[PDB]
């Protein structure tokens, strides 16, 4: 049924999303993007590891599903289902077309599948875990790379978990009462807005 992925590897066409102009589009294979202990707070998983695209390329949704399943299975089998949080950072929004399913007359294709367009340096999957669980997660992502076409790099992030702060400035902000939890993520105090609300929301804030 599926053509080989080599037929849809390159970003040759303009983005073709679902809209009010194409409606007979089937759903993407990947439906879950957060796996593992997704409800864990920021502090339990300081280590972040990314799979990063070195290619301007298209990845099919079923390839994303296969890689997600492979990485999840390996990391769960080795270190347990609650030792990590894996997030897929690409969503398939681009509709691929197929023509045959006379000649080149009326050759406009029909929806065939979904793909995500990734750039060079774009993150495909991220995994936040404990430091002691580093070598496991890498090997989990190293296998997921086999489900993708092109070249991908495994990069250990300098930042704390999924936060945009480095591992040293997150500590600097937390020890000053400058950060609170909001479930799986955090909220940072801002020096702008209403003073009373900001002081109430961050009671442990040492003002300078």
């Amino acid at each position: 049924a599926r053509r080989p992925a080599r037929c849809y590897r390159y970003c040759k066409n303009k983005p073709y999303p679902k809209s009010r102009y194409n409606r007979a589009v089937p759903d993407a294979k990947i439906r879950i993007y957060d796996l593992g202990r997704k409800k864990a707070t920021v502090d339990e998983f300081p280590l972040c590891i990314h799979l990063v695209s070195n290619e301007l390329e298209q990845l099919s949704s079923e390839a994303l599903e296969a890689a997600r399943i492979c990485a999840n299975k390996y990391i769960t089998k080795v270190s347990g289902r609650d030792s990590f949080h894996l997030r897929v950072r690409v969503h398939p929004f681009h509709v691929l077309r197929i023509n045959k399913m006379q000649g080149m007359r009326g050759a406009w294709g029909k929806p065939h599948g979904l793909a995500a367009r990734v750039s060079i340096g774009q993150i495909i999957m991220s995994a936040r875990t404990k430091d002691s669980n580093k070598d496991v997660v890498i090997e989990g992502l190293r296998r997921a790379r086999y489900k993708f076409p092109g070249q991908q790099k495994i990069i250990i992030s300098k930042k704390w978990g999924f936060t945009p702060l480095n591992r040293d400035e997150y500590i600097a902000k937390k020890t000053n009462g400058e950060v609170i939890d909001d479930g799986a993520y955090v909220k940072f105090l801002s020096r702008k807005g209403n003073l009373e609300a900001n002081l109430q929301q961050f009671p442990n804030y040492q003002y300078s």
């Binding site: 990314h50 340096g121 990069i155 300098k158 930042k159």
Partner: protein
């Protein structure tokens, strides 16, 4: 098939600016246009009468006629291998004075003003504009500004 109507392809050009819809400020209706004046053509989407064609949106021309609520504007358009004389009737809402003359008109006054001063002083003065010349020699003092040595930095991943 093909559609080539009057306002085809004018989706964004004839739009009002963001947070600038509504009624026209009346300084538009108070400006006085004379024959020979130079005006910038910019179609206003809220007034559909006297609206210019999409080609003339962004063109500058000569006012050749003044009517009750409009002015006649002269535009030169390339059609093939020569220019064709066009005469467009435009309501003053789509017409603004071009600022290119008021800059040049001041230079006419300044050149006249500077020439009479030199004549009154009996000297000669040069009024041609000059392009930016190469800069001349100069001495750089390092007192308080001793050079700092810079080097290319090592590669590092920041994600």
């Amino acid at each position: 098939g093909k559609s080539r109507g009057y306002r085809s392809g004018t989706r964004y050009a004839f739009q009002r600016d963001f947070k600038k819809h509504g009624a026209i400020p009346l300084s538009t209706y108070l400006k006085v246009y004379k024959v020979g004046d130079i005006v910038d053509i910019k179609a206003n989407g809220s007034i559909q009468k006297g609206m210019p064609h999409k080609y003339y949106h962004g063109k500058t021309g000569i006012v050749y006629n003044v009517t009750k609520s409009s002015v006649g504007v002269i535009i030169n358009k390339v059609v093939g291998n020569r220019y064709i004389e066009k005469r467009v009737n435009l309501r003053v809402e789509h017409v603004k004075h071009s600022a290119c003359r008021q800059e040049f008109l001041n230079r006419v006054k300044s050149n006249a003003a500077k020439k009479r001063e030199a004549k009154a002083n009996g000297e000669t003065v040069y009024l041609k504009r000059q392009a930016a010349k190469p800069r001349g020699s100069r001495i750089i003092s390092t007192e308080g500004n001793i050079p700092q040595t810079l080097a290319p930095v090592a590669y590092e991943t920041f994600i």
